[PDB]
Structure 1
Amino acid sequence: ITGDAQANVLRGAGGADVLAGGEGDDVLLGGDGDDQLSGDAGRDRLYGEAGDDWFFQDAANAGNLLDGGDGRDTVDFSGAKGVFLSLGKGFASLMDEPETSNVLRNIENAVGSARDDVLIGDAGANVLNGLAGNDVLSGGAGDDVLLGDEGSDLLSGDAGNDDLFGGQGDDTYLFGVGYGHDTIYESGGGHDTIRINAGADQLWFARQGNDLEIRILGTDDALTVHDWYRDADHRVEIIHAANQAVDQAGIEKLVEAM
């Protein structure tokens, strides 16, 4: 269902619909099912309604409302500067241009751009995908999946039990007291980093299968590095404990000491 240069009202039904507003200020109502909505140019109002809907939005096109409705909905800015978005506060704006903004409501997941983005989740379960560029990803509460992809990314799952995929490039992972049970999955990078804001002597390092497990004594908090021992591509090269740094040789010492 494709609009034209007029201000259109386009309404899908119960199936998986593809709605595109074209030019002008459109209203798109996806109905039930897993819809794909694009406002295109103009200032558009975009309602995914029930189902797991997808929104294709240019971060530089300001003045739209993207409303996922019920279900697990994704906003995608990947179709130049990056995007700053917050699912908790409910906005997305052009990096380097806060006045160029869009309203986000009822959206659970976000895909960024090939440029440097900042993607912030909310207290629910979120998937945040930075794609290329040097991105900052913050999960907030709830159980999140963060994908840094290519580039030098900063990942923090925050509270809840999070999966952190830094991707290729030199990635930094944040962890601390109250961060729950997080797992890191590394694919590549000669200088990945973990920064743990625990007191260093709260930390307990252990090998569990082929994983490295880092616990904070006194808490239920644990950071697992998946397949650490299986291959060098899955390792992080520096671990910081508060203001103290440890290398792989140093980590293995701590493990062996137990």
Structure 2
Amino acid sequence: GSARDDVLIGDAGANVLNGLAGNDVLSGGAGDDVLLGDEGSDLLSGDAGNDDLFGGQGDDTYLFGVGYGHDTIYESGGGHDTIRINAGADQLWFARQGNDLEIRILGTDDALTVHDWYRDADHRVEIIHAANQAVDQAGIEKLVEAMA
């Protein structure tokens, strides 16, 4: 990446993509990728394979869906980070696992983990979108508690 707004597209191998400053778009493609949004409002999509997603500071967006495998988000900060999951809300299973939040797509091996979600506010993503539903932090908590 560069200080500008970049679009960084991986290939089928395990890739490291670093957006640097600016509002970037990072798409890993297949393989196990490491994606960094760094400073700015970035959109990170690991795609297939098991990807580590570091949106960095700023308000970052993370994509997930069927066939995305097991991806882990490591947030650093931002008051309006978001996850956008391409599935119906009733296909989602929310659980606490230690200090992580784990979101599974029912009927699949696809799972999205937010590392240290329960440690502190800077590790949280503030809105989780399913197809036509935006779930805020109080809503996420209620799903976790209900599905325990």
Work out whether the TM-score is over 0.5: yes
C-alpha distance in structure 2 between counterparts of 1:173 and 1:242, whole Å: 14
CA deviations 1:150-209 (Å, max 9, x no partner) are 000000000000000000000000000000000000000000000000121110000000
C-alpha distance in structure 1 between counterparts of 2:97 and 2:125, whole Å: 16
- SS across alignment from 1:256: helix
Query: Alignment RMSD, CA only?
Result: 0.4
Tell me the TM-score normalised to structure 2 length: 0.99
Cα displacement (A) at 1:242: 1.1
Cα displacement (A) at 1:146: 0.2
CA deviations 1:121-162 (Å, max 9, x no partner) are 001100000000000000001000000000000000000000
CA deviations 1:82-104 (Å, max 9, x no partner) are xxxxxxxxxxxxxxxxxxxxxxx
C-alpha distance in structure 1 between counterparts of 2:144 and 2:113, whole Å: 13
C-alpha distance in structure 1 between counterparts of 2:32 and 2:58, whole Å: 24
**Structure 2 match to 1:117:** 6
Q: Which has the larger radius of gyration?
A: 1
C-alpha distance in structure 2 between counterparts of 1:174 and 1:244, whole Å: 15
| Greater relative contact order, per chain length (Cα 8 Å cut-off, separation 6+) | 2
As a proportion of its length, which structure holds more helix?
Answer: 2
Cα displacement (A) at 1:244: 1.0
Given the alignment, which residue of 104, 111, 127 partners 1:215? Answer: 104
- SS across alignment from 1:253: helix
C-alpha distance in structure 1 between counterparts of 2:47 and 2:133, whole Å: 21
C-alpha distance in structure 2 between counterparts of 1:124 and 1:162, whole Å: 12
C-alpha distance in structure 1 between counterparts of 2:72 and 2:24, whole Å: 19
CA deviations 1:65-116 (Å, max 9, x no partner) are xxxxxxxxxxxxxxxxxxxxxxxxxxxxxxxxxxxxxxxxxxxxxxx10110
C-alpha distance in structure 2 between counterparts of 1:257 and 1:133, whole Å: 39
C-alpha distance in structure 2 between counterparts of 1:153 and 1:228, whole Å: 19
Given the alignment, which residue of 78, 98, 107 partners 1:189? Answer: 78
**Structure 1 match to 2:27:** 138
Tell me the TM-score normalised to structure 1 length: 0.57
Q: Which runs of 5+ in 1 are unaligned?
A: 1-111
**Percent of residue pairs identical:** 100
C-alpha distance in structure 2 between counterparts of 1:131 and 1:236, whole Å: 20
C-alpha distance in structure 2 between counterparts of 1:122 and 1:199, whole Å: 29
- SS across alignment from 1:254: helix
Aligned length: 147
- SS across alignment from 2:141: helix
